[PDB]
Amino acid sequence: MNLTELKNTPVSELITLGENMGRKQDIIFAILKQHAKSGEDIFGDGVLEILQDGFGFLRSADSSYLAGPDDIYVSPSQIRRFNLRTGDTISGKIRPPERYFALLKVNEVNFDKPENARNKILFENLTPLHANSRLRMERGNGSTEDLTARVLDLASPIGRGQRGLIVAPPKAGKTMLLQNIAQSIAYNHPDCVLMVLLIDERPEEVTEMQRLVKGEVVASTFDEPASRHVQVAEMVIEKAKRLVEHKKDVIILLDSITRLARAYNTVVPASGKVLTGGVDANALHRPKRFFGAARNVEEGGSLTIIATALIDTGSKMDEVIYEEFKGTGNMELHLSRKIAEKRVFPAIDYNRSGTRKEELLTTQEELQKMWILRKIIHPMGEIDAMEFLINKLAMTKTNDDFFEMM
Amino acid sequence: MNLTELKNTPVSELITLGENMGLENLARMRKQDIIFAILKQHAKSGEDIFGDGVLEILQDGFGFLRSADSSYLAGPDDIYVSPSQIRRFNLRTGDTISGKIRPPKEGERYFALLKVNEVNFDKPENARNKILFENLTPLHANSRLRMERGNGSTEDLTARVLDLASPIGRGQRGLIVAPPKAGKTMLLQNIAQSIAYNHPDCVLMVLLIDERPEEVTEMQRLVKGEVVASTFDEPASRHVQVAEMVIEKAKRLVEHKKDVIILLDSITRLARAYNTVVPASGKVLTGGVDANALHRPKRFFGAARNVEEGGSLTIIATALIDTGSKMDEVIYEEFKGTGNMELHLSRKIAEKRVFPAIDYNRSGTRKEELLTTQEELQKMWILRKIIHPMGEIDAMEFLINKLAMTKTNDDFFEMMK
RNA sequence: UUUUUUU
Numbered sequence: 050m051n052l053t054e055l056k057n058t059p060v061s062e063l064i065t066l067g068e069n070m071g072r073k074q075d076i077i078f079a080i081l082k083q084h085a086k087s088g089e090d091i092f093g094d095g096v097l098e099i100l101q102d103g104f105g106f107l108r109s110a111d112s113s114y115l116a117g118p119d120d121i122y123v124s125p126s127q128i129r130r131f132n133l134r135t136g137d138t139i140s141g142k143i144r145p146p147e148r149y150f151a152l153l154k155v156n157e158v159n160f161d162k163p164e165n166a167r168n169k170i171l172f173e174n175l176t177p178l179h180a181n182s183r184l185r186m187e188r189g190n191g192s193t194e195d196l197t198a199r200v201l202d203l204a205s206p207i208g209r210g211q212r213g214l215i216v217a218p219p220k221a222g223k224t225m226l227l228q229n230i231a232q233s234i235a236y237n238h239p240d241c242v243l244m245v246l247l248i249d250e251r252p253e254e255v256t257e258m259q260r261l262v263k264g265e266v267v268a269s270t271f272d273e274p275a276s277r278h279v280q281v282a283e284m285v286i287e288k289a290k291r292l293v294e295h296k297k298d299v300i301i302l303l304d305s306i307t308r309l310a311r312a313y314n315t316v317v318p319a320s321g322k323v324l325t326g327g328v329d330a331n332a333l334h335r336p337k338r339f340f341g342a343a344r345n346v347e348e349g350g351s352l353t354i355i356a357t358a359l360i361d362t363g364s365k366m367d368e369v370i371y372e373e374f375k376g377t378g379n380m381e382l383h384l385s386r387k388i389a390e391k392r393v394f395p396a397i398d399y400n401r402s403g404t405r406k407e408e409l410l411t412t413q414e415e416l417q418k419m420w421i422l423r424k425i426i427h428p429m430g431e432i433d434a435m436e437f438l439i440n441k442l443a444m445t446k447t448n449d450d451f452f453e454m455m
Numbered sequence: 456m457n458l459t460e461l462k463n464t465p466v467s468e469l470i471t472l473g474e475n476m477g478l479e480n481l482a483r484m485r486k487q488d489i490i491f492a493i494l495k496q497h498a499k500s501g502e503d504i505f506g507d508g509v510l511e512i513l514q515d516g517f518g519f520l521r522s523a524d525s526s527y528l529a530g531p532d533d534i535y536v537s538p539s540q541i542r543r544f545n546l547r548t549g550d551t552i553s554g555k556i557r558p559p560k561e562g563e564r565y566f567a568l569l570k571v572n573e574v575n576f577d578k579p580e581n582a583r584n585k586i587l588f589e590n591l592t593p594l595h596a597n598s599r600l601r602m603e604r605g606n607g608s609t610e611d612l613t614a615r616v617l618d619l620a621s622p623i624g625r626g627q628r629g630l631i632v633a634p635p636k637a638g639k640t641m642l643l644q645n646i647a648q649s650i651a652y653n654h655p656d657c658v659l660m661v662l663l664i665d666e667r668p669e670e671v672t673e674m675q676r677l678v679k680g681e682v683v684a685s686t687f688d689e690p691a692s693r694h695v696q697v698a699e700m701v702i703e704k705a706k707r708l709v710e711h712k713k714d715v716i717i718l719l720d721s722i723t724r725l726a727r728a729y730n731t732v733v734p735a736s737g738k739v740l741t742g743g744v745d746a747n748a749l750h751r752p753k754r755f756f757g758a759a760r761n762v763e764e765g766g767s768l769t770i771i772a773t774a775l776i777d778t779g780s781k782m783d784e785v786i787y788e789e790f791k792g793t794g795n796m797e798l799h800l801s802r803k804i805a806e807k808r809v810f811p812a813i814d815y816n817r818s819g820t821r822k823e824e825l826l827t828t829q830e831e832l833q834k835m836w837i838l839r840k841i842i843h844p845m846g847e848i849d850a851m852e853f854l855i856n857k858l859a860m861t862k863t864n865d866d867f868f869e870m871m872k
Numbered sequence: 873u874u875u876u877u878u879u
């Protein structure tokens with residue numbers, strides 16, 4: 050008997066058990082309470098958020114990890130006993146309430162025994178590194194969607210702990226690029242913990258993502274205030290850090306981080322100093338720490354963040370935000386509006402796209418092939434570049450056979 | 456028996472060492488407690504204890520010996536230095552101190568300093584009589600700090616082009632100016648390697664402010680020197696205090712006639728941190744910089760100088776431009792009017808994967824005749840006249856191909872004839 | 873007011 054499981058099952062399945070014992074939120078509360086009279090075990094789970102007083106609540110993914118009526122109370126002694134912090138996934142027995150359910154004991158901390166999670170190294174003390182193991186994006190299945198992933202592997206490689214972004218103007222193909230990322234992440238690397246954080250973007254894109262991606266989708270559409278965007282993103286990035294502390298390879302696909310930085314700018318207190326474009330002089334610190342959370346860890350695991358970014362918006366702010374994040378991350382995949390307006394996809398700007406320390410992600414042969422191909426494409430215009438590379442790649446199914454044509 | 460030596464050793468060797476002394480079970484308690492209990496037991500035997508750290512004098516007249524593992528911030532193992540000890544040897548903030556220590560007594564929370572054995576790697580008496588950094592007579596850089604390895608390395612190309620475009624002397628006040636992803640950090644790393652090989656006599660420090668954390672570990676495992684860092688995970692308040700400790704430590708070593716070099720990355724972000732903590736003056740410059748915000752970072756950069764009495768302080772720091780934020784153009788141009796050397800890197804050259812992506816015409820060093828021989832300057836002068844009409848990319852492709860033909864710039868000069 | 877608007 051689990052709480053969040055009762056919330057998932059339809060109300061019809063609920064009334065069946067409730068009548069046998071004797072709103073949907075109340076009938077669940079009545080089933081759990083009457084069951085507590087029997088003396089049998091009752092359960093609940095969630096992602097922890099530690100308040101200022103020292104206690105915490107297990108937030109629900111249904112509420113985008115915000116406050117909810119079905120949230121479980123976590124006492125400070127429980128947090129101290131297992132050294133819990135915000136972002137930890139906690140499961141265990143609870144008790145009927147006083148207007149809040151309360152956790153009796155925790156069985157699993159981050160899908161693992163609670164005792165093992167106590168002597169772990171904190172995320173801040175993990176030794177950072179440049180990305181070693183690479184996340185190759187190519188499916189090699191011969192599909193038209195694979196072309197996007199194949200050009201990405203040549204232009205800007207992605208590794209574990211990468212801190213990259215997809216820069217483009219509106220309607221250039223950022224989101225669809227990111228959807229193409231998710232498909233290759235789940236098909237090529239099922240081992241990775243895939244999360245998709247959608248901030249201040251379209252409402253049809255989260256439902257499309259929820260059914261397209263194999264993973265978790267946390268969203269906060271543009272129907273939501275900027276303060277909600279910040280709180281939702283903080284919960285997600287803290288949950289990612291906790292899994293990295295358990296040596297997990299977490300990947301966050303953010304869309305968009307430029308709008309996430311805007312939300313911070315609208316929230317930060319006015320400092321009396323404003324950068325070019327209307328960005329407060331202290332507004333970009335927290336977005337830098339968010340994006341900058343992605344890193345490769347020597348002790349094990351990694352956190353990878355690939356986020357979409359806006360440029361050529363006519364607003365100087367987004368140019369400042371892009372350049373700031375560029376100086377924070379180590380990978381950029383640019384997309385040109387001129388290429389996208391000619392219906393040439395992917396609309397990748399090859400000469401601007403690139404990845405730092407790409408030798409740590411590529412074989413020596415692969416590095417030379419991409420180096421030569423880099424020099425050949427550079428003199429061409431951006432449209433002529435893609436149309437040239439699309440045809441050469443279309444001739445073959447995989448990049449390896451393309452390397453052999455050279 | 457030293458505190459920081461015990462902090463460096465792994466916990467496994469500490470527990471075994473503590474059990475040999477015969478102590479209550481050390482496996483449960485934290486590593487900090489193992490060291491503390493091990494230090495106390497050694498004090499019970501009557502044997503001496505030792506500690507060390509860089510001094511930071513508080514407002515009340517006493518100070519503490521901060522440790523490098525805390526980025527010279529407040530630490531649990533800080534050693535109290537009494538005011539009488541400071542007056543005896545005229546100690547000031549930044550002085551590296553080593554001496555005998557004792558565990559804290561009842562009602563105390565810190566290790567205390569009994570006797571100071573070494574002040575700035577020297578006899579404590581010599582520190583009493585000294586000329587202060589503020590009174591040292593400044594000079595333009597005299598002694599050349601040549602970066603060229605000469606080993607025919609492909610990485611040496613960056614050092615060779617640097618020597619021709621913007622020479623570096625002892626006491627230089629230089630800038631590696633470029634937009635993001637142009638090659639500033641790796642060029643600073645290339646400089647760090649050249650300093651460790653060609654100038655092991657110099658005291659090398661690498662200060663990393665508000666930059667990537669993976670570059671911190673990359674730097675400390677690459678350079679043969681001390682690395683102090685404060686990544687972008689840290690607030691601006693921490694950046695300032697860490698930078699102030701490092702710059703004062705450099706001034707103290709220069710007072711001992713040492714040649715100190717500080718590779719800072721980035722100084723633009725250090726200037727932003729000062730602008731974050733500066734008191735509002737009611738006057739804001741173009742780009743969102745307070746009218747009084749750049750005085751402190753200007754004195755920091757301006758600390759680099761050549762000293763006639765002996766020693767020097769060199770600072771090679773990276774700066775950002777073309778960020779879309781006018782603030783960084785103000786910060787860069789303000790530092791250019793403070794320093795005397797700029798090595799520009801071009802995003803246009805870097806996008807073509809041409810490295811080092813050096814803007815030759817914009818780079819340069821002031822009073823470079825004081826750092827070059829008569830014929831070396833005449834050869835660099837002719838080389839600039841030839842390179843100037845070329846484009847940014849054509850200039851580097853031309854110069855790198857010519858330099859790659861030879862191992863050293865000297866042989867390259869002999870080819871020019 | 874300055875900064876932002878703003879080149």
Ligand SMILES: Nc1ncnc2c1ncn2[C@@H]1O[C@H](COP(=O)(O)OP(=O)(O)O)[C@@H](O)[C@H]1O
Pocket residue numbers: 197217218219220221222223224225226389394395
């Ligand atoms: N790989 C692709 N193949 C075909 N069409 C594409 C592709 N990528 C983008 N597009 C076109 O671009 C339009 C908008 O792309 P989108 O990903 O929403 O850009 P952005 O996220 O930058 O707004 C889509 O309607 C689609 O028709």
Ligand SMILES: Nc1ncnc2c1ncn2[C@@H]1O[C@H](COP(=O)(O)OP(=O)(O)O)[C@@H](O)[C@H]1O
Pocket residue numbers: 376404405406407613633634635636637638639640641642810811
């Ligand atoms: N000398 C060089 N040789 C090869 N690649 C370089 C060189 N300098 C820079 N790069 C490439 O540029 C990327 C970023 O350079 P970096 O030094 O971080 O620039 P910045 O410090 O200005 O951001 C590196 O990851 C590297 O791939």
Ligand code: BEF
Pocket residue numbers: 218219220221223224359
């Ligand atoms: F309209 Be796109 F998502 F920038």
Ligand code: BEF
Pocket residue numbers: 375376377634635636637639640775
């Ligand atoms: F992004 Be670079 F380090 F300026």
Ligand SMILES: [Mg+2]
Pocket residue numbers: 223224225
């Ligand atoms: Mg989109």
Ligand SMILES: [Mg+2]
Pocket residue numbers: 639640641666
């Ligand atoms: Mg850098």
